[PDB]
Design a protein around this ligand. Structure first.
Ligand SMILES: CN(C)C(=O)N1Cc2ccc(Cl)cc2[C@H](C(=O)Nc2cncc3ccccc23)C1
Ligand SMILES: CN(C)C(=O)N1Cc2ccc(Cl)cc2[C@H](C(=O)Nc2cncc3ccccc23)C1
Ligand SMILES: [Cl-]
Lengths: 298, 302
């Protein structure tokens, strides 16, 4: 029993964290094979113009107490790739994957190439992440672990004026309509990740919390009219299919659980809590719920 | 900016997780140097758990009755001893991934990270606190026994908890790494119940200071309180008494925000009376109590 916000074990990623220094700027890098990946703003804009003026010895890369020698440098979108003379002996089996809003991942927050914390979070529908980051965190990465393969999905680049965070995939493409520049940028109006809330309601049922259940069902169209009114993301037939195993396990059809959510949105919790929470949690996907409620290991 | 429930990076602990098998029972062990630590109930059958005599059960065991697996490698047990509720299995190989470590016993209200494991393999990491009733509200299934709680300060891992059992309310009980249980619990299937749980007051105040540091001031008020008047109100909401030690501990946060501890206590009294009125504090609709004053400073300052 119990339901916690749980991150993947960070060990495979900790062995890849390095410190990258260029001039006065110091941030984090990801050392995989003989390449160190980091945000391109470490050179700071006309990034092609700034990068051409740099030589290999302008970048100081530190892996623990060992200095790595940079033998090449190139740019791919908003990520800087620093070729080093040594392949990382702790390189895990890995992939670079771009994730969709609503998908969750673990973030290994780092400062000066040293991991300080690990937390779980979701890519919001407005493409921001509600993280916990201070100056020097840039270059910290987001990942998922499937079997023994680490899928790197996020690299931290900046904090927006509302305190939320913006970054790229490991190919340097931003999530959301952001640019790596000191300029007026704002996150769009956020919405609730509906399929994730339903997954968390199934996790509550699995843990013995049933007060919110009711005899009612709904059509997918009637629920989506309600979701739009409460700034909830539309629920697709794909989402309904994805919730299938949880629906079969608890004996509560997905549209039956949707009628609980529709009543919770129009009436509130009425002093009650679900899994110790007074708000509807949306940072657990249907796969996270199955993985945690069945003890899948890495 | 931002405030998250944050666990320590688990790498140093992942390299210590092993699988321990004795008969039909399989649980997790912590391999440090040439010793594997695990709950002593691994020697029990489910028909022994009601009233086990661990000295009697252990004396009947030989080294080859314990199968220890570190990844795909079998470790050879060359000795076995019991220390309180923990079994110590001497092995013929020192763990090359042994980090700098300490065994520390923690007090209620203290937080730590849990590396949840099954069959010696880590599956997840989460942050939690020792409750005032000595239980932990974890996320554990059968086979998680032997999973450990830790903190990392500098490069030293301080092991503070080893999971042993789930109580009937779904909460968990365990020991420090010397085998001494937290709370009035015993490693037996006898009827045991956790005492009434209470809110960790010093932790809620620390989290209200974190909210102020992140620009949230809606809950502040022009009032102050005596320490005694605060405790008389707080007790009525099942909140732990706040001691002068707690007031002293909140001193740095009080100096940093410019809000005296007894001034923040009056905000907490008001919040308990009014509720949140549709508002949130640090994205939460409830008062959070699993961040200590030390966690708040570490996360907000480095
Ligand atoms: C936020 N700020 C006023 C800055 O000094 N920045 C300006 C800026 C502009 C563009 C880009 Cl791509 C990066 C940055 C930097 C940036 O966002 N880094 C930070 C990341 N995460 C948490 C941060 C908390 C505090 C400070 C800085 C953080 C540095
Ligand atoms: C709770 N129960 C009736 C059991 O199966 N047990 C009885 C029992 C009694 C004493 C001691 Cl020291 C250990 C145990 C075992 C136990 O608590 N293990 C579990 C640990 N954590 C989460 C668990 C979720 C589910 C099941 C079992 C969990 C096994
Ligand atoms: Cl302590």
């Amino acid at each position: 029993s119990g339901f916690r916000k749980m991150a993947f074990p960070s060990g495979k990623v900790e062995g890849c964290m390095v410190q990258v220094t260029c001039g006065t700027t110091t941030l984090n890098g990801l050392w995989l094979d003989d390449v160190v990946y980091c945000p391109r703003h470490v050179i700071c804009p006309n990034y092609e113009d700034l990068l051409i003026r740099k030589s290999n010895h302008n970048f100081l890369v530190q892996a623990g107490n060992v200095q790595l020698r940079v033998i090449g440098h190139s740019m791919q979108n908003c990520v800087l790739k620093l070729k080093v003379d040594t392949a990382n002996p702790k390189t895990p089996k890995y992939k670079f994957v771009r994730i969709q809003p609503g998908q969750t991942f673990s973030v290994l927050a780092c400062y000066n190439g040293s991991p300080s914390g690990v937390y779980q979070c979701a890519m919001r529908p407005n493409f921001t992440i509600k993280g916990s980051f201070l100056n020097g965190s840039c270059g910290s990465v987001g990942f998922n672990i499937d079997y023994d393969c680490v899928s790197f999905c996020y690299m931290h680049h900046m904090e927006l004026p509302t305190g939320v965070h913006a970054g790229t995939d490991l190919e340097g493409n931003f999530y959301g309509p952001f640019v790596d520049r000191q300029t007026a940028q704002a996150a769009g109006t956020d919405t609730t990740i509906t399929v994730n809330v339903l997954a968390w309601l199934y996790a509550a049922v699995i843990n013995g919390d049933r007060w919110f259940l009711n005899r009612f069902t709904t059509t997918l169209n009637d629920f989506n009219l309600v979701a739009m009114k409460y700034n909830y993301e539309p629920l697709t037939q794909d989402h309904v299919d994805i919730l299938g195993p949880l629906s079969a396990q608890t004996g509560i059809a997905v549209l039956d659980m949707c009628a609980s959510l529709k009543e919770l949105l129009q009436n509130g919790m009425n002093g009650r809590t679900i899994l110790g929470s007074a708000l509807l949690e949306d940072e657990f996907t249907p796969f996270d719920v199955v993985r945690q409620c069945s003890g899948v290991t890495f």
